[model samples]
Target chain A: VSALNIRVGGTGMFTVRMALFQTPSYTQPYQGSSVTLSTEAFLYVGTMLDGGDLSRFALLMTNCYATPSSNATDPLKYFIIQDRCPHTRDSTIQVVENGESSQGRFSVQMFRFAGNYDLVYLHCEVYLCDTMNEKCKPTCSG
Target chain B: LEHRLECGANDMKVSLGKCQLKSLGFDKVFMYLSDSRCSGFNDRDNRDWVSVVTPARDGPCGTVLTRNETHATYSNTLYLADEIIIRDLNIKINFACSYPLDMKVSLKTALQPMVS
Candidate 1:
């Protein structure tokens, strides 16, 4: 058996969920993509994993941003998270969680971009890590 | 007295006689910066209050940032903390650094409906 070889280290069966929620508890996922409130809303964006063993893996939201439309490639963007760190200019931005569990969470005060666009979309780039082999939390410990 | 202090070399900066401020006869001599929300004279100083800003959109010394279509503006006000208890001796100077910005990157453009 030692002389023979078999294929190993295949990618895991995994699923991910990204959504904007009404609260930090993430109990209520926002039903619509459009928000018309005059006051700035504390909308929570969350990422979660599925179809895999939760204890063995971690999730990292390495980058997150708001764009004017559903097309994430939209040129106009405001970064909320970069390199796993929150944009701390005024610090109304908050990173609720990252790399500690199967879910990563953060919040940003809703920004209405300069254009007359009434819609905004949140896009994120994330990674999955095997917690058994690596330290997965934010390097800034933010 | 004017030669000893740095002030009014440019509109963005202002300086007053340190002794002039001290001579005002107040219980506390304090100054702070607006926009950056910075308090002057932490443990870091050399017998005079100086704020050295290595400025960024987000930076040290509690730097605040505001930007617009054509430029990013970094500003902070230097205040004298006036004798009137309710107000401040504010904005003899508001240090501002402006950086240019342009969203269009060689793309031919025209205004489209809604921009949404």
Candidate 2:
């Protein structure tokens, strides 16, 4: 099994952000294996504000699935791995704003089974809201 | 294509073997400290992953190694994405010196549709 690593960079209203996810090692679990997935996020805020605080940044493992199996045929087979913010399933970490910079670290351990699938794809999404009371959207379209 | 390299003064080459996809772009690349010899590790202490951008020399798809004094075993992995079909990837690492490093690199192309 090959570990999954993904990095994304973008600029928002008042911040430039980078998000990353790295799996420690590959897993070839016919049954299942415990694995730790690590995540690091960085947010740099500039002169921009929407009358809201920068403390509403959150990280979430949006979806995970394996190929050559039922996951491809059925969307219900998708797994909600982690959500660091409330109203979500698996919230891995919360980004804290310090000065003009914000950073976050998270580690999650779970039993994952590949079940003879060739590859497992994991997707992580980062959200920056106006307030802490805001909930994370289920899809990126929001 | 994805390429992996051992941490040292070295050069690595990768050959994209018979890829059906025409255009490919690098999705992500990262480096980390490893605790094992071959392709994997078990120790979790002091393990951190650092994201790296593409090397900006020669061509758009190449990486070069410089000297960094540390006893940590470092491994790097690159994820490649095609517009349509995923393909096989190959990599070559050239270790230049006796550095205390154990590196394992592999490529992973996802079959699931990427979210825009």
Candidate 3:
């Protein structure tokens, strides 16, 4: 004889779910040429906590922008993430992509904090190429 | 009373009498005198005639009236009460014939509006 069984523990009924997705950015003028900033995720995250409405958690990103030079402190280019959800306390940020009209491609990355995911920080990974032929390279490319 | 004629003086002594009828009561009843205009026939020169007023006995023009009178001869009846409580000395008299002399009566009472 054979038997199959499934078991579940704790019966305090409360369930919540949330999802994150990226939207396309429209083209706009940059310095002198038209540029469009778009978002790309090198990493996606979701974690469970001991006992709290996980739905209440959110990510807040500050400075996200483009720069002419490889230096992180450069201010020539930058964008800000100000749109945040009130009830959820979450935010998303990305650099303004120069679009096809500009010279090259740019990269932006966001990182979640270690412990509770209450705070988030952003840093621009610039990829610039003078001519469309050479394409663009992240400032970190050396 | 006729001494004025003997002295060849037409000047008459104006008598003013005030009686504190009720010493301590709802109101202090008293009579007194007030001042008014007076003229004589012989006096051609304009002079301030200081006439003395006395209480009268009868008539709307006579004295012997309730308190709170003004000018002319008359008798006035008044009441003195504890102003600390009842005001206007609790005066309850009706209209009476009394001459108002230059007499004034003041009593102590609880500071009330008009009656006191």
Residue B14's lDDT in candidate 3: 33
Model 3 lDDT per residue over A1-142, tens place: 8988898788673322211223224233223232222223432212112333333322222223333334557433334322211111223422333322222222224332111122333343222223334443222111
Query: Residue A65 of model 1: what lDDT?
Result: 80
Tens-place lDDT per residue, model 3, B34-107, is 21122111211233222232223443222243455454323322222222112122332222232335666887
- Candidate 1: share of reference interface contacts reproduced: 0.00
- Give the CA lDDT, 0 to 100, for residue A83 in model 3: 22
lDDT of 2 at A31: 32
Q: Each prediction's Cα lDDT score?
A: 0.60, 0.31, 0.28
lDDT of 2 by residue, A1-142 (tens): 9898899999655443332333222111123242233223221111123333446644333333323333455442333323333223334422233122233333333322222123333333434443356555433211
Which structure among the candidates has the greatest TM-score?
Answer: 1
Candidate 1's residue-wise lDDT over B1-116, tens digit each?
22122222222333344455556643444455443234334222344433323334454543457888788766655544532111222224455666666545665777668754
Interface RMSD, per-candidate values to 1 decimal: 14.8, 13.3, 44.6
Per-residue lDDT of model 1, residues A10-54, tens digit only? 565568888777766777887885666543566767887876878
Better of 1 and 3 by DockQ: 1
Q: Between candidates 1 and 2, name the one with more favorable DockQ.
A: 1
Judged by TM-score relative to the true structure, which candidate is superior, 1 or 2? 1
